Scaffold this active site. Structure first.
Site, PDB file in Angstrom:
ATOM      1  CG  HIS A 267      -6.736   0.397  -0.574  1.00  0.00           C
ATOM      2  ND1 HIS A 267      -5.451   1.137  -1.079  1.00  0.00           N
ATOM      3  CD2 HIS A 267      -6.378  -0.436   0.076  1.00  0.00           C
ATOM      4  CE1 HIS A 267      -4.492   1.228  -0.427  1.00  0.00           C
ATOM      5  NE2 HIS A 267      -4.698   0.019   0.195  1.00  0.00           N
TER       6      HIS A 267
ATOM      7  CB  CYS B 144      -1.556   0.907   7.196  1.00  0.00           C
ATOM      8  SG  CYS B 144      -2.645   0.170   6.288  1.00  0.00           S
TER       9      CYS B 144
ATOM     10  NE  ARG C 295     -23.195   1.285  -1.953  1.00  0.00           N
ATOM     11  CZ  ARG C 295     -24.049   0.356  -2.360  1.00  0.00           C
ATOM     12  NH1 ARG C 295     -23.597  -0.601  -3.401  1.00  0.00           N
ATOM     13  NH2 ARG C 295     -25.010  -0.108  -1.530  1.00  0.00           N
TER      14      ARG C 295
ATOM     15  N   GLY D 292       0.560  -3.339   4.040  1.00  0.00           N
ATOM     16  CA  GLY D 292       0.461  -4.846   4.912  1.00  0.00           C
ATOM     17  C   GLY D 292       1.530  -5.594   4.946  1.00  0.00           C
TER      18      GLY D 292
ATOM     19  CB  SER E 156     -11.066   0.573   1.183  1.00  0.00           C
ATOM     20  OG  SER E 156     -11.330   1.602  -0.351  1.00  0.00           O
TER      21      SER E 156
ATOM     22  CB  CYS F   2      -1.565   0.337   1.103  1.00  0.00           C
ATOM     23  SG  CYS F   2      -1.687  -1.519   1.822  1.00  0.00           S
TER      24      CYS F   2
END
Lengths: 394, 394, 394, 394
Positions: free
Chosen positions: C350, C380, C220, C382, C249, C89
């Site tokens: 994302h 953050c 949405r 992974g 996300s 990320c």
């Protein structure tokens, strides 16, 4: 009856090992090989064939109606209808019974019946039409999925074999003994040339050019109980297993065929047949013990023939698993010296669609070679069926 | 003959569109639905069935012997043998002919014959056993590969259809006219409730729970020549094309079944049958023009029946392509008001394995509904075959 | 320092929904779009770029060095080196930090940095080189496998999110509140035209020809807590779950880019930059709680800048999960009116490789639009990392 | 400069043949092996590493951020950031240059840089998310697709090699001579134990338990021109081909690593380094002739170092193809006794992501072993790039 259906000719390819000597040969070329050859041997012109009927189980990727391809590849005209039947392991024998019916009722005059399978060439399967938004998808093995897995209990044939082993009390030791016997009988028959007549060579292109394949590939010569008893059970690994690779047959490729017509048509043509077909049966049993299908099948065929079991000189009882063949022999009280005397599928292999006809081919040549008179071919069938035929040597 | 084989009951599912209303229903559940229903309608207990025979072409991924699964899912015991035949498009009709043979020869007393296909569920195929060291590998479409591609010329059925269009001079305009006719006849029949009797609802789980599917899905109501003539040829795009999606059938899901026994067994049971089977034929022709298979097939069946073509009140001639059905009608000189009068597969769809029996189901109910007497069901078959049956209303 | 690295231009595509508006657009065309556009906006000729650096995570099937493809597709010469970095990320932000380093040390003069991802186009994976003799083989989803699954604990990022929810006591209700907030802020920003400046339209061929895509697809509108509280937890279904699709996300497609050079080079060129880069940090933490990576990252970057946390006017803290963003804000004691004020990834989406730069693009335009001075972008990562950058508006 | 970045330690795995000795070892375990080992050799505790940077090209199926996995598997804490860069063949060398930058600018103190690749484990790819209604779909080879195919001209690297052969007039005979030379130099070096120091054994589980793999697998001892001149051109079979398997490198598995820090940090720690890094360059060229990338790269690096080409004692110039390495040497006018003196990738193999660092590892140990002073490592890169580094032995 009075003018019974007879078998004039019978031939098979060798049985190839999984991914072995015949793996590069499409199943329909195996079919063509045996079709062409039985016509040759019967001295019947291809244009005189009324129809072609073959058992064939794993047909995915083989193209449109592979029997028709096989028929035409053998030099049978486009005018001759050709089609397939599927009854898992019984498929190759069912093909012959079906021919008996079309000839008996007067719809066909001459039929080439048989079975064929290239399991080496069976593909893996993926369902891709919907579209998987997110997640893993299986590439399923068609052999396992469509060939070897009971649809009712979702278990391998080898599990049903363990059920029969348990229920008919066929020990690990019993199974390994049957396996050694089968292997040794096959090796003896090979060395004695007993398969030479029934085998027809298959042509295969190699890097060093064309070659003839004419020895069965799957036999394990020098098989012995000491070696076999060291193996671990394959399907059932909770310490109650008995079935291993050594006391089960394999995944295999091959084809076989026979030429059928009425006795009267044979007489007219100056042909002496291998045998007359006296009777046949198909029966259903519980899927969990599909292996014992041949028990009711044999009893009904033999009864329909007007025979007692003692009257049968030679049995071919498909040896998918020692556990099952042993159980059949035990329950019927058959002399093991009358059963699978050239050996069975543990040594020779089991190309699903072909096996029904393959054991018939062997039966007929054994009866001929030994000058014996009455034979039974029989097989258990996944999903809980049995099929059996009675033949009598002319 | 004297004690002819009769059809007591006949039923079909709706025909679903590709990836449509029946796509989530395994083919064997379609089979079970029609099997159970025809037994219900004939008032024949499932344990009285001698055997089950179904046509089924695209069986990859369907598990071990899907006919047997279908049979048992209908409540037929494990004791009843069940098996499949494959003769591409003719498979469903071949199943019935085969039943005629087992009953005629005295091997079976009662048979449930039929055909079944879920093409939506046909997988893609990969050969993975060898192992590809380096390079691309295909995921082949089993529908195309095994269902729709001529094995001799490596071309789509739609190409063979263009050969017949060319050779029998069926223009684009002719084909579109046949297509409109077929669509309009189907819409008229639907609105008039003509299919209500033959259809049996299929049960399908949805997100909003269980539902019954009981309307054929593939028809395009309001079909018109103006719209159709705007489409581009699909198979042959060098400016000589005539076949488009509008004047060809589709890829479809469905099943159909019939219950058969001897007239004497029907009389004994107090059943009045839909019809007696008078004759049937299977023939071979050149693969390049497989579409004209029904010409020799029909001529032979009709001849075997002792009929002239004028004697036939109603024909069902599978409408795989307008080009082929038109060519058959032109060559035989049939009245188009006697041919596919509820419409054909252009409107209704073509689930390969089912279609042979599906058109028979429709035939029989049409004959019944109109109080007409003599019918012919016929289909062309990929690889160059034809199959036809003659039926006469009792 | 004295001659700090500055960002002159910053742009992004819209963020597309999984299999949505950008799915047909190869990732490198997304890259080209933003690359070309930032050069245009900075008024910098493509031949003056020293190098291109992009984050890109799921590169399978994208061809050789997709950054280089993207670079050249934007009109940057072949003479300009172009390459990619992967730090899950954080990849898009890491690209910019890396540019800061090459410019700071005097190796590059002008750099286009960014990130890009088309997750819709990520393939499934099969290992086929060995060859599977017998058995099922997986078609693994590269998104799940390479993008979303912790390699140390073999669990989805959403599971690590539940660990942080638990440990930082962020309730289901808290998460749904953050989610509604994020959705409402995004909808407010959209309606107010706050994204207009930063968005660059993407060109897409449709059946009705070429179209411009310029609205973010994933939001949405009308999101509400009542609806959200009805959903079931997605990752953890043993009754202890909090994370659902509404408070996480998505899987998304997009790209973003920035143009960087020294303040002195900007002055020489007559360019006023969006901001100067003041500091950045990368840190490691435990994989099980990878979500809290930005806590140490932010604290170090802010410290390195000579700032207190109160000094930060605006934060962009990637909103992979409400559970994580809430936890970060709670622990650091941030004013939620300073954090993700145009909304975050719960609403916006994302696209892994792009997100690091995407939030930077938004940050910079927000600071500009509000006339605020000091910003922090952070994510953050992974596997247990965090990355953060400090920027100050000139 | 004054306090230059130095390399303290350098190690590599053997290079495995495609589907050979290292194929069962995940790429990150190859990474861990070399990472752990270089730390061991440098006597640097894993917790003192500032960051890990690895080149890695074919990362599909390797899980989330395989460098981070590799780092942690070597015993480096979770607190240490770890990430990957991709610049096709240059990736492993680019990793080291990037470390030079983070250390030079004062962001990192100690860095483990390297490259890693298991091409044997690279999967095939299928796009399955949309869903294919009807038709064949490819299983694309990620090696070919992402590793070996020029994205601009859609041709294999071997085709670009033929362009360079043609344009720089490197005959078939020339290429085969270079190939024999490379093979013989590698065999001489192996027998003399020249690789012993740089190699670190890889642990592999076999059926007969654990084993150490410590000999390079790809060399073809007894290589001779007579044999080579019999082979057919592989990429270009219209009679203008020159590149064959014998005069190109292969598909291979391996990893390599180096430990970097400032000279001052080395002095403080009582470490004597292998070499100091003096300069490096990255350049772009036309994709059609990507092979000649190292020409401008070397000239710029050497120039930046204040060197003339004569000053370079030893070159390592990646030998992807004899055609390219020959062309580079011809154009620059290098002494072939200074170039790839332990042999090159034709003999040793080319694990894409690893090769950049692998040749550096070899360079440094060669310089050490021969007591020579100045070295150049360089590689061409698919898509049209070159990368080069200058090192000087302390």
């Amino acid at each position: 009856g009075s003018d019974p259906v007879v078998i004039v000719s019978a031939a098979r390819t060798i049985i190839g090992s999984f991914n072995g000597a015949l793996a590069a040969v499409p199943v329909q070329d195996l079919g063509s090989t045996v079709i062409k050859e039985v016509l040759k041997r019967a001295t019947v012109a291809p244009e005189d064939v009324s129809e072609v009927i073959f058992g064939h189980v794993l047909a995915a990727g083989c193209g449109q109606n592979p029997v028709r391809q096989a028929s035409v590849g053998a030099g049978i005209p486009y005018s001759v209808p050709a089609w397939s039947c599927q009854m898992i392991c019984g498929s190759g024998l069912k093909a012959v019974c079906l021919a008996v019916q079309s000839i008996g009722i007067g719809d066909s005059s001459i039929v080439v019946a048989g079975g064929m399978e290239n399991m080496s060439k069976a593909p893996h399967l993926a369902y891709l039409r919907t579209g998987v938004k997110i997640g893993e998808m299986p590439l399923t093995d068609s052999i396992l999925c469509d060939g070897l897995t009971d649809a009712f209990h979702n278990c391998h044939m080898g599990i049903t074999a363990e059920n029969v082993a348990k229920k008919w009390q066929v020990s690990r030791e019993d199974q390994d003994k049957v396996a050694v016997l089968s292997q040794n009988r096959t090796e003896n028959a090979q060395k004695a040339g007993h398969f030479d007549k029934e085998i027809v060579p298959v042509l295969v292109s190699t890097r060093k050019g064309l070659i003839e394949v004419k020895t069965d590939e799957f036999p394990r010569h020098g098989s012995n109980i000491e070696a076999m008893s060291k193996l671990k059970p394959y399907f059932l690994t909770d310490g109650t297993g008995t079935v291993t690779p050594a006391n089960a047959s394999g995944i295999n490729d091959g084809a076989a065929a026979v030429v059928l017509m009425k006795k009267s048509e044979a007489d007219k043509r100056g042909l002496t047949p291998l045998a007359r077909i006296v009777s046949w049966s198909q029966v259903g049993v519980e899927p969990s013990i599909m292996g014992i299908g041949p028990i009711p099948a044999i009893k009904q065929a033999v009864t329909k023939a007007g025979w007692s079991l003692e009257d049968v000189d030679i049995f071919e009882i498909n040896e998918a698993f020692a556990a099952v063949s042993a159980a059949i022999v035990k329950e019927l009280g058959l002399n093991p010296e009358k059963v699978n005397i050239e050996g069975g599928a543990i040594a020779l292999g089991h190309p699903l669609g072909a096996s029904g006809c393959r054991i018939l081919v062997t039966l007929l040549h054994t009866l001929e070679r030994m000058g014996r008179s009455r034979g039974v071919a029989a097989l258990c069938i996944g999903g809980g069926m049995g099929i059996a035929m009675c033949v009598q040597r002319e």
